[PDB]
Amino acid sequence: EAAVTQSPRNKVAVTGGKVTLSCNQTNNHNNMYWYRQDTGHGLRLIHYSYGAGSTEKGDIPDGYKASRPSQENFSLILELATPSQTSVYFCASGDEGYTQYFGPGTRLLVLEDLRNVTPPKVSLFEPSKAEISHTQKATLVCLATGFYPDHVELSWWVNGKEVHSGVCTDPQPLKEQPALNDSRYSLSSRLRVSATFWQNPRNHFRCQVQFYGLSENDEWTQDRAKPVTQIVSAEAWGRA
Amino acid sequence: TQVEQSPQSLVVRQGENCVLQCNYSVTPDNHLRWFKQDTGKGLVSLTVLVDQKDKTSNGRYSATLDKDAKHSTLHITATLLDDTATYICVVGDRGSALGRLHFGAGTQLIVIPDIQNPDPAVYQLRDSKSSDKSVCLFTDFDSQTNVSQSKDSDVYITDKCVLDMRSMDFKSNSAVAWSNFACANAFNNSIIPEDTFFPS
Amino acid sequence: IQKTPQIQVYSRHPPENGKPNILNCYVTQFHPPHIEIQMLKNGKKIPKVEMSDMSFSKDWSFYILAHTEFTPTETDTYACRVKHASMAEPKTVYWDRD
Amino acid sequence: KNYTFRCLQMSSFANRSWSRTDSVVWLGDLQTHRWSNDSATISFTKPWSQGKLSNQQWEKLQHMFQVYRVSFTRDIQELVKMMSPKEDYPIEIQLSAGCEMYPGNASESFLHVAFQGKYVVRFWGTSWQTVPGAPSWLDLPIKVLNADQGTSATVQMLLNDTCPLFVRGLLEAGKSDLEKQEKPVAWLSSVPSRQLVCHVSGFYPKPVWVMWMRGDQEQQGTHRGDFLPNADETWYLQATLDVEAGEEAGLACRVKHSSLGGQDIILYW
Ligand SMILES: CCCCCCCCCCCCCCCCCCCCCCCCCC(=O)N[C@@H](CO[C@H]1O[C@H](CO)[C@H](OCc2ccc(C)cc2)[C@H](O)[C@H]1O)[C@H](O)[C@H](O)CCCCCCCCCCCCCC
Ligand SMILES: *[C@@H]1O[C@H](CO[C@@H]2O[C@@H](C)[C@@H](O)[C@@H](O)[C@@H]2O)[C@@H](O[C@@H]2O[C@H](CO)[C@@H](O[C@@H]3O[C@H](CO)[C@@H](O)[C@H](O)[C@@H]3O)[C@H](O)[C@H]2NC(C)=O)[C@H](O)[C@H]1NC(C)=O
Ligand SMILES: *[C@@H]1O[C@H](CO)[C@@H](O[C@@H]2O[C@H](CO)[C@@H](O)[C@H](O)[C@H]2NC(C)=O)[C@H](O)[C@H]1NC(C)=O
Ligand SMILES: *[C@@H]1O[C@H](CO)[C@@H](O)[C@H](O)[C@H]1NC(C)=O
Ligand code: NA
Ligand code: NA
């Protein structure tokens, strides 16, 4: 019942830039805790708080500042972001008891430079008639291409509602040019439905890629469109 | 680190049981908690053990704690695909908020699903907008089949991935290939079943 | 709040000139427990004075017993000097055989 | 017949990092244990200090205390952070824990806590509580401490079961030391200002009787001082009488003590 929320959920930042990770909790818990999770390590405590105005150093506080302006909100501030702060950050809260209630986590990537950031192109590939004939099933394939960096969330939407059943997305994007320094990525996903579901012309199918890039405040000196955090999608209607 | 987990990683087949272990040196040791973490997701508490010689159960999950040995095991009975995750052991040094948590680095479990009726095929799929572009979908192959990268570096092939149509109780493997190229030639660098359907 | 230590100096056995004895310095009623106790012969620090473990009474005030071997004479003076945060200057209490 | 067993803990926290914890243990007026900050283990100060505990029972008990000392130290430090900035270093904490032993297998256990030299907190029944006069801010520490069921269960067993049992054994094992008789030696002196002093030293146990006397007449001007300890676990006492100079002769100091067995000490001036 005691829920904790984190914002943003995903962030791309530049070295030397400022990053604020926010944590909100409406349980009236005095105590809040910031952790980072890195491969080959358990969660490590950065900063904690016993109440409003209170912040305390954890195990690895260097390069981080904490802020507890109210009971509800605990902020983690990276004044001068470094690549070594690329991580997944978890916030937690609790009362006097021993249980800590964890938020859903925040993925942070700190790049050296933002020059290569590019949003995806998204295409939706319609099921083959052969598949429908052979299996009585219909697989849609979604393809996101030409994006950098690799921080995307791909999701499937049928009639304005997200579907999870019959979905599978590549565990990681693959590199389009493995030879090159800052290769663009491609990601694919499948949605499989029954033939009759796809054959229904009132079923609207959409593949959505949430891309994480620059904020409105980030400086941009290049010619192309500013590669901001955005959604790119592709859609098709069912048909007989 | 005062909390060590074993194995580091393991692969099991659907229906099999597995044992995950936790060894710690944390003093004092008020309680031990097991978390499940799906890839790119948060921490889901499975159980908490508190007693000197404790035993808990939560559906197909059961756990033991032996404080004298400073050792805990998590048993997963009859693994399902959705058990694919990292399992994290956490020891708390106090029965209150004055405590610090001590996290293990986790154990990666992969459960290979049972493919009931394989029907391997390679289909061509066309772009909803511009029909000139296409992908090749290798689907409905057995978990025994391995999908290799292409020799051509202008061809792209994904690693195999399994989807679950829950309502139909149906699972199928697939892989995708595209370029700028025929579907007959797409998976030439892979050892694919001989009965693979290539529609005309 | 800090409380001013009481010092009591007394001999273990009946004092007789030229006869080895033990001199006790009993310091009580102080808070906080950080204290420095010196036993002096003719104003000079006596070496290797034994200290009891610090303790406290029912009223939560601390006490400690310093003691040393001494041989009283007609000339020699013996004193106990205590510095404690509750006092601006160190307090000296002289052994009076009478 | 009634002996009080006292475990006395003194903890000083100078700042966020520096702290020290020292403990002494008393059965009546005899020291049975010492636990210096510098020491990993509890020291016996008597041959019988282990009581009737086996080596395994003692090791388990000591280990519990070892964990406690480290834990207590961190807990105070964390509670200070929690109340910030209401309370600040330096901080002195005292614990007085033990049991009073009555005849016929009866006892009362206690655990009292003083903060900055003032009794504020006790363990009673199954939980921590503040006592009358305690500041309100302590309500949060008490809430946190009471959240820890494991500590609660441990303390309960410690106070209800362990103390009485341990002390029963201590009384058996240390019988000869507890019941020892040591003879007082007296001597007289005078400081003009005149005031006569009767020194009584080397007696055990504590109960004693000292009065200045003219023949058979108890001089009601006798002022008994406090009981002062010797290093050898005997007691010192002095009784003073204020007199007019010239009226010295005829005065004696009578000392009654259980060790003399009827033979009172009389010293004439
Ligand atoms: C008491 C006398 C008995 C006689 C014994 C024989 C005497 C021999 C001589 C001994 C010489 C030593 C002298 C020392 C004198 C001091 C003695 C009095 C202190 C007694 C308190 C002992 C507490 C013991 C517990 C402890 O260590 N807690 C500590 C560790 O706990 C952790 O570890 C355990 C391991 O046992 C528990 O897990 C295991 C567990 C889990 C679940 C269950 C069900 C059971 C177990 C626990 O749940 C787990 O949280 C815990 O940190 C306590 O909070 C310590 C502090 C207690 C003191 C509080 C005083 C109040 C101060 C107010 C502060 C106000 C100031 C504010 C700025
Ligand atoms: C240990 O002994 C205590 C009581 O003994 C007292 O406290 C000790 C710490 C020592 O200082 C002793 O010298 C002292 O005599 C037991 O505490 C008692 O527990 C029971 C329940 O376990 C309490 O009953 C409750 O009453 C309340 C009403 O206020 C109800 O709400 C509850 O439902 C429950 O019935 C009882 O009040 C309590 N006694 C006191 C005075 O607080 C303790 O159980 C015992 N522990 C063990 C494990 O032996
Ligand atoms: C009192 O004892 C404690 C514990 O033995 C001391 O704390 C340790 O100090 C050492 C330095 O010698 C550090 O290496 C450790 O990190 C500390 N240990 C623990 C468990 O915290 C403390 O310094 C002692 N106090 C004094 C004043 O000597
Ligand atoms: C904390 O207190 C000690 C002793 O009072 C003192 O020497 C020092 O200023 C502090 N310790 C350090 C080194 O921070
Ligand atoms: Na804890
Ligand atoms: Na404070």
CSV table of C-alpha atoms and ligand atoms in Angstrom, one decimal, chain D residues 14-15 17-18, ligand 4:
chain,number,residue,atom,x,y,z
D,14,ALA,CA,32.3,14.0,22.4
D,15,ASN,CA,31.4,14.5,18.8
D,17,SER,CA,33.0,10.1,15.7
D,18,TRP,CA,34.7,10.0,19.2
E,4,LIG,C1,36.1,14.8,19.0
E,4,LIG,O1,36.5,14.9,20.4
E,4,LIG,C2,37.8,14.6,20.8
E,4,LIG,C3,37.9,14.4,22.3
E,4,LIG,O2,37.2,15.4,23.0
E,4,LIG,C4,38.7,15.7,20.3
E,4,LIG,O3,40.1,15.4,20.4
E,4,LIG,C5,38.4,16.1,18.8
E,4,LIG,O4,38.3,17.5,18.7
E,4,LIG,C6,37.2,15.4,18.1
E,4,LIG,N1,37.7,14.3,17.3
E,4,LIG,C7,38.1,14.5,16.0
E,4,LIG,C8,39.5,14.2,15.6
E,4,LIG,O5,37.2,14.9,15.1
